Design a protein around this ligand. Structure first.
Ligand SMILES: C[C@]12CC[C@H]3[C@@H](CCC4=CC(=O)CC[C@@]43C)[C@@H]1CC[C@@H]2O
Length: 250
């Protein structure tokens, strides 16, 4: 049986609530405070999910938390895009069952341009007819798609893991294709899609970083873990010390 895919399906997180009050009028402060809370909650699930991935424990302990803290934005945006596609055909951004963004909220969040890119990603799942299984393997690969320019504690273990997840993606593409030209076209499409997540994540990193710095001035609350990661890890990315791994040369 499909052992790798069996695992990915088994560990996939369930629904996560934001806790937002949908009876109160929309506002920048309320919307972003709710998104930040959702981030804190989702992070807990992402950590447990990551820790349960095949071969994850092969990584040095320090590298395990590092990759999670560098890739969380991309991982969460990719999953949100998938949820939006499956639940509302990318019409709105389905952050959570209790936090669905319509155009009004996209504007009130002062994140309209970023929401546009996130919604575009969501539409790609439909345009490219991405399968639930392709989604699972791609999301797993996103965890191993951003590292320090000077390397990790034990880079060899990481390189081996990333290699194996790329191999599993190629395997999923061939599980219903006889012509190699079709496999190659699909792999090209999927790697392009994966790359497209990085620029979106970077824009969100810049936005949340700026928001944190001025959080006290605009009444936006940041939970413990979010404030830590955004002030300690995110800047490493924005300053170019940690960079995404692209398939194609940008
Ligand atoms: C980082 C952030 C809170 C957490 C948000 C993020 C947008 C992307 C996103 C999608 C999710 O489904 C989980 C929460 C996250 C990860 C928000 C952009 C600015 C805000 O501060």
């Amino acid at each position: 049986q499909p052992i790798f895919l069996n695992v990915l399906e088994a560990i996939e997180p369930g629904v996560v609530c934001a806790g937002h009050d949908n009876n109160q009028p929309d506002s920048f402060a309320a919307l972003l405070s709710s998104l930040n809370e959702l981030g804190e909650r989702q992070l807990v699930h992402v950590v447990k999910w990551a820790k349960a991935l095949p071969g994850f424990r092969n990584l040095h302990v320090d590298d395990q938390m590092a990759v999670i803290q560098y890739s969380w934005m991309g991982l969460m945006v990719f999953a949100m895009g998938w949820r939006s596609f499956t639940n509302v055909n990318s019409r709105m951004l389905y952050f959570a069952p209790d936090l669905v963004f319509n155009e009004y909220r996209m504007h009130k969040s002062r994140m309209y341009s970023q929401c546009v890119r996130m919604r575009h990603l969501s539409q790609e799942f439909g345009w490219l007819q991405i399968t639930p299984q392709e989604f699972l393997c791609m999301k797993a690969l996103l965890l191993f798609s951003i590292i320090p320019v000077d390397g990790l504690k034990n880079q060899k273990f990481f390189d081996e893991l990333r290699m194996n997840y790329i191999k599993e993606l190629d395997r999923i593409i061939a599980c219903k294709r006889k012509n190699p030209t079709s496999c190659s076209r699909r792999f090209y499409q999927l790697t392009k899609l994966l790359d497209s997540v990085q620029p979106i994540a970077r824009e969100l990193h810049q936005f949340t970083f700026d928001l944190l710095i001025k959080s006290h001035m605009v009444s936006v609350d940041f939970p413990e873990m979010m404030a830590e990661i955004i002030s300690v890890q995110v800047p490493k990315i924005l300053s170019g010390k940690v960079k995404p791994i692209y398939f194609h040369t940008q």
